[model samples]
Target: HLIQFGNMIQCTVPGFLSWIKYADYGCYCGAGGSGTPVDKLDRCCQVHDNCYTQAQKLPACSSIMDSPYVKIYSYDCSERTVTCKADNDECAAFICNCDRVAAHCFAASPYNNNNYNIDTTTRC
Candidate 1:
């Protein structure tokens, strides 16, 4: 796998709250490609979507969104069975890492930092 299931990662690069204005282009989460993150944050979702679609397949990767930070909807990761166990030989790590970077990537966009009207739902 590319990464670990519970790999430790941090949101280190803060986009100075305001940068050169990165364009989102589009988002993959919500319907119609017009979601909460119709900004640079959309790039994050696009890339993550690529990972899930083109890259390895994971058995079950839990949703890690719905935080107090972002004012958006979430999946709570409760309904699905997501765990890093020995029985399942799947690329959960890769998928989780995909989500991990996606979350931080979206966070990298200052628009989602209590700035834009809508924020991408970051699920890691």
Candidate 2:
């Protein structure tokens, strides 16, 4: 399903949703620099769209169908690029696992403040 809000579009699938909601605006910037217009975020949207489309079909792969973690193995800040791959790799989870949590933490860009990726590991 697709939902539209103003110029933005949202896509929903069985296990995930579109990640990009809007373009960078205020206090945040893209490789194009700060205040990049929403219409100029085509590349960002394209990456997100491609990811959502491809990921929804991974279960047929048999191996990654039941993956526990969708690893973001590559990202390029300067190029405004992102890529993800599936895995069953375990992430150590603990109430006191502060350092690892911090290492994995991230603050989303102001334009699209929502996250689509999920951490599937609940315990080490």
Candidate 3:
């Protein structure tokens, strides 16, 4: 049984307002301007409302480019920011199942005890 901390993981979000520019690229949440109300706001990059939406896994027939699972951590709606739990084991459990990327994620996560392999090949 092995759990590699730093490796590739795959999951889907309900349906991101915007496609992740780069899956390898990191995101910023809770970003704000130097003003109070005049300041700008940021979104919960990956997770929505601190909850994972299976919409990402929805079929194209459903009109939404759904994914099986999504990478999540935390979303401070009160602060208008997002945080990703790339290392959270719970995320794997939440997204894992019989036919979703969550299942893939859980399978890929270290928790599976050396059952899966992380594809390190980058897509450029």
Candidate 4:
């Protein structure tokens, strides 16, 4: 019944380029911790003519990550950027589903230009 606006996220990994929205919740994190049906994006990366692949797989939000649902907003080949939409309802929590700390870092940025590494750390 609610939708929150989450900051955009970009992957720092090359080739593994991608982005996602962070929203929703389930009982795992307590009240409002349940996830809802939303749109999710996969393999969403930039493409340069025949140089890179320009395909994004859309999957049911049900199968996406839990806690908060992160959806894809856009994929720009020219800018090499992927935009994500995060709902405020799910991100208001201190712990949030995704790295709330890191999410905040992007949100604080001017144009959500903050990119992150998903291998080692979780926070920004």
Model 2, TM vs. native = 0.22
Name the regions of candidate 4 deviating beyond 4 angstroms.
1-6, 10-65, 69-92, 95-98, 104-124
Highest TM-score: which candidate? 1
TM-score of each: 0.39, 0.22, 0.16, 0.17
Total residue pair clashes for candidate 4: 13
Q: Which stretches of candidate 3 lie over 4 Å from their true place?
A: 1-51, 54-99, 112-124
lDDT tens readout by residue for model 3, 9-114? 2223222222222222212122211111111111222332132344344342232332223333221111222233345354343333212322223223222211
lDDT of each: 0.40, 0.25, 0.25, 0.24
Supply candidate 2's per-residue lDDT for 1: 12
3-88 per-residue lDDT for model 1 (tens digits)? 22112112223324322222323445433343354556766656765666533333333333321112121111222223333433
Candidate 2 segments whose C-alpha is farther than 4 A from its true place: 1-39, 60-124
Reference-based lDDT, residue 102, model 2: 15
- Residue lDDT tens for model 4, 1-124: 0122222233322232233322211111112212221111110111011111111111323333332333323222124233333543222232132332233333333322222212112221
